[PDB]
């Protein structure tokens, strides 16, 4: 979601 956090 964020940048690496899905």
Name the experimental technique.
NMR
CB atoms closer than 10 angstroms to residue 5: 5
DSSP 4: S
CA 2 to chain centre: 3
Q: Which two tokens stand for residue 4?
A: 């690496």
């Amino acid at each position: 979601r964020r940048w690496w956090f899905r």
